[PDB]
Design a binder for this molecule. Structure first.
Ligand SMILES: [Zn+2]
Length: 209
């Protein structure tokens, strides 16, 4: 029903201009979001709605299971643009419970190309296999791995030279880990926020350029 989307768009734009005739014109002059959202592509987790934000407020990357991989130039380019060009003050790594990508990493079905994309989550589940094994249900295991996954990605972001060099030059920048409940609409802090070099293990601290 593609036509509906066009009709929706026309109605949306016109309604906004009725309340604020300059909303788009002003926004178009400059991009100044204070946040980068890194989250899952899952249709149930749209960034702006969940945190009550407006067009212009959130720079967004979404991918399968919200992973930040060391040699993925897609996500790395979003982070670099956000930190170096836009100078966002916060990176919000948001995973969600019931994530299908995370769930697939606990099962042994072949999905195709995505096998490689998700294998770091499988590695994480293997790393924490004893911990996960204590949990009686598959849903509990999935949801805990969803949390562990967010925590790993926060660490990954904080280990980049992009983030560390921003800190080196006195830029204020925090990396947060949150988890969204698709069952209840609640966006919850995992309390793993990193805001400076002193919070990193020595093994990950890069010397300044
Ligand atoms: Zn997901």
């Amino acid at each position: 029903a593609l036509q509906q989307l066009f009709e929706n768009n026309v109605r949306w734009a016109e309604a906004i201009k009725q309340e604020d005739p300059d909303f788009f014109a002003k926004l178009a002059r400059q991009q100044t979001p204070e946040y980068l959202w890194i989250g899952c592509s899952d249709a149930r987790v749209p960034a702006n709605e969940i945190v009550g934000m407006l067009p212009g407020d959130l720079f967004v990357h979404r991918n399968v299971a919200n992973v930040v991989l060391h040699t993925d130039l897609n996500c790395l380019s979003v982070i670099q643009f956000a930190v170096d060009v836009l100078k966002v003050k916060h990176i919000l790594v948001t995973g969600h419970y019931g994530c299908g990508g995370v769930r697939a990493s606990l099962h042994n079905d072949q999905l195709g190309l995505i096998d490689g994309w998700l294998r770091s989550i499988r590695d994480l589940a293997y790393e924490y296999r004893e911990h996960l094994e204590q949990l009686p249900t598959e849903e509990e295991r999935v949801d805990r791995l969803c949390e562990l996954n967010v925590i790993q990605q926060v660490a990954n972001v904080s280990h980049t030279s992009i983030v560390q060099n921003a800190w080196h030059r006195g830029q204020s920048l925090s990396v947060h880990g949150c988890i969204y409940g698709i069952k209840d609409g609640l966006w919850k802090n995992l309390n793993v926020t990193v805001s400076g070099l002193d919070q990193l293990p020595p093994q990950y601290r890069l010397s300044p350029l």
